Write a protein that binds this ligand. Structure first.
Ligand SMILES: NC(=O)N[C@@H](O)C(=O)O
Ligand SMILES: NC(=O)N[C@@H](O)C(=O)O
Ligand SMILES: [Mn+2]
Ligand SMILES: [Mn+2]
Ligand SMILES: [Mn+2]
Ligand SMILES: [Mn+2]
Lengths: 423, 423
């Protein structure tokens, strides 16, 4: 039967993971690969070549989402889609996102070796970017596929990176958005245009490893939000301005960072998280009192309302701190505040069947990280396959998933794609 | 007499201040000009051109201290020296340092127009750098002039900037330190090689302005120190690492910054200051928990012992915070910890006499900022002339001293140089 015939080239997949990690602005073992940069362009070509070698028909949309299709026996039907991203935040690992892209191509190669003949077409999606590094916008590609008019409008009119390079200029530099007359609405997919969407991904947590399980069947994705905060003071000479006359924007930021921690812990749930991953002082000189501070805050919960309470408290603390410190709260912006998504019940059932037929132990579990799957769920039934990762590490170079774990995930992906294709 | 004949080109001096401010990595009205960068080189050339126009013998030492001498009638005597710096910390003003360099050149021209005949030679010094911006080392030039073997060794062996450019490579890109067999001891001046050293400088405080006085005669310089601190944690994924398992280096840094403020305030003296001017997070991504944080701390007091107590407490707090946060205190480095200095009493005498002869009001006062004068005081009798500045502002673009105030400082400098030269 099909399950018993599935064979992955595990060392070969690992070789591709290692090769792709070479396209990086950080020295190995770290990876940095930001949307539309030269390293991103080289990684795209590498992946598109693999898609072509796998016999896929390759196309790209206006923002550089890349699609590789294996035409089915009934090609007019909504296809079964799978994929992930290949961008990497500064000094991160080689497996986040990449496993679900290279592993999806390997799943196609695995199904072909087994002589599987899809009824519904299978389509692999390389999402143009999932990480918010360049423009502050996470899942830029999938948010657009899911039809966000507000994002399309923003990308055309206002969005720039930290070097004031516009989204359009950056996209065009990479070979995309070459139609001046496109409001980017051309990227939008109709609801139901895919029968289902699957994403293979490392767990980014220690659960599967700690429990000794092979596969996680994802049931939902937690609700993510991000905030940008700026404080402004008078600054001046660190040696000469006596303490009673100061309004130190850096100390306001320090206090807000600690308040973020406090409000997260106030939720009384271990599922609530909040982080200050960016805190910048201006002018940023040892002997200059900071006159501006900038914080970027990530906060999430499986419960949307509980997360929103944290956000409201953070805003209250930012105002209280500004008044006490005598600084201006010059910016408090909610960059995104998104709902959680539920995986489709029939997709979950097929994934769990797949794991069982492959003799792979599994559990149903929630994803704490967000993924392109979060937005694809607005377009079609969605599910995710988690594989174990070492100590749960992710977003750091110690991130690791074994060749066998990756192959197990690929086999589950192949078998779930096959079940959905032959609905 | 000499005093009544002194005449400054006030608008011309202002014009040169404005021109020099154009050599900047920050857009007007802010100035950024860092040691050995292209902007620094351009500004050095501008000043050397002015020195040559004033008829001075111009020479440079191995690190780029620039000397401009007017030969006296008795040239073998130790010369009377004056000068300042022209480097500028990020987003600062146009007057800090620059007034005492361009004003020193104007003082020579003032004396020449009056037909002054020096006995002792007069020498203007453009110190290669006073600001710690590039290498974390303040007064790099004058520390070397004052014979710091420890500094000379570090500069040749370990010192690099934040882009990992070595001191030697940076120096060489600007045309300095080209001799491979110089251990930089060639820069050292013998004690007593100058008869005296004077620095004209904006007050960087509101005292002269608030009291309606023309000139500050500086009697002492406060004791400066700086610390470099790093915390190390595990970092990881901002969404997936639950709060109980974190060791957030960013929150360690936040807590240490607030502790700095606390320990400064505990001194019970208004003369004590401390600042966290630099606080950086690594990797510095919104969705990555900081695994490293870096603080640069400035702390000073007129009383050295009180200053040292703040430092000891800051180090105790850093260890306590590291243990509580479960992070590693991976670096705690006292970059410098320098004693205060006293101005020479006969230099003070001549300066106060000069101000009175020019019908200028004056008061005795302390410098809270540090200056090259702090280290020149190790080589020779030292003094400083303060001029008033708007609202006391410094290290920001609102920094301002009027053409008349600068001219007053120049005349006091001219007359004080003349008294010292003829002594
Ligand atoms: N899968 C994943 O790590 N997405 C992240 O970029 C995130 O912050 O959730
Ligand atoms: N004069 C002066 O401002 N020196 C400064 O750079 C300082 O921090 O003291
Ligand atoms: Mn990620
Ligand atoms: Mn990912
Ligand atoms: Mn300064
Ligand atoms: Mn200065």
């Amino acid at each position: 039967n099909l399950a018993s015939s599935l064979s992955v080239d595990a060392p070969g997949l690992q070789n591709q993971i290692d090769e792709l990690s070479s396209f990086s602005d950080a020295p190995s073992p770290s990876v940095t690969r930001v949307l539309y940069t030269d390293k991103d362009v080289s990684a795209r070509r590498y992946v598109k070549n693999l898609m072509a070698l796998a016999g896929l028909t390759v196309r790209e949309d206006a923002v550089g989402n890349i699609f590789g299709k294996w035409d089915g026996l009934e090609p007019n039907l909504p296809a079964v889609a799978t994929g992930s991203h290949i961008d990497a935040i500064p000094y991160s690992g080689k497996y986040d996102g990449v496993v679900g892209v290279l592993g999806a191509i390997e799943a196609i190669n695995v199904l072909k070796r087994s002589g599987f003949k899809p009824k519904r077409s299978l389509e692999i999606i390389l999402f143009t970017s999932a990480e918010p590094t360049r423009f502050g916008i996470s899942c830029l590609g999938s948010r657009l596929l899911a039809g966000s008019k507000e994002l399309a409008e923003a990308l055309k009119t206002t969005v720039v990176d930290g070097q004031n390079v516009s989204f359009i200029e950056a996209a065009r530099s990479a070979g995309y958005a070459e139609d001046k007359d496109d409001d980017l609405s051309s990227v939008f997919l109709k609801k139901g245009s895919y029968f289902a969407f699957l994403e293979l991904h490392i767990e980014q947590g220690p659960i599967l490893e700690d429990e000794g399980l092979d596969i996680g069947v994802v049931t939902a994705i937690a609700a993510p939000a991000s905030l940008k905060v700026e404080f402004e003071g008078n600054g001046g000479h660190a040696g000469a301005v006596l303490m009673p006359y100061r309004n130190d924007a850096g100390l306001a930021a320090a206090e807000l960072a600690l308040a973020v921690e406090k409000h997260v812990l106030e939720s009384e749930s271990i599922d609530t998280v909040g982080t200050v991953g960016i805190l910048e002082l201006h002018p940023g000189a040892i002997n200059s009192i900071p006159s501006k501070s900038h914080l970027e805050i990530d906060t999430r919960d499986i419960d949307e309302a509980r997360r929103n309470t944290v956000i409201k408290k953070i805003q209250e603390s930012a105002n209280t701190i500004a008044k006490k410190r005598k600084v201006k709260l010059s910016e408090f912006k909610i960059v995104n505040q998104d709902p959680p998504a539920l995986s489709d019940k029939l997709v979950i059932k097929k994934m769990a069947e797949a794991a069982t037929e492959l003799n792979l132990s599994h559990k149903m579990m929630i994803s704490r990280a967000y993924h392109d799957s979060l937005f694809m769920a607005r377009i079609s039934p969605m599910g995710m396959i988690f594989i174990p990762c070492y100590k749960g590490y992710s977003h750091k170079p110690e991130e690791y998933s074994s060749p066998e774990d990756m192959a197990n995930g690929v086999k589950v992906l192949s078998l779930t794609l096959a079940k959905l294709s032959l609905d």
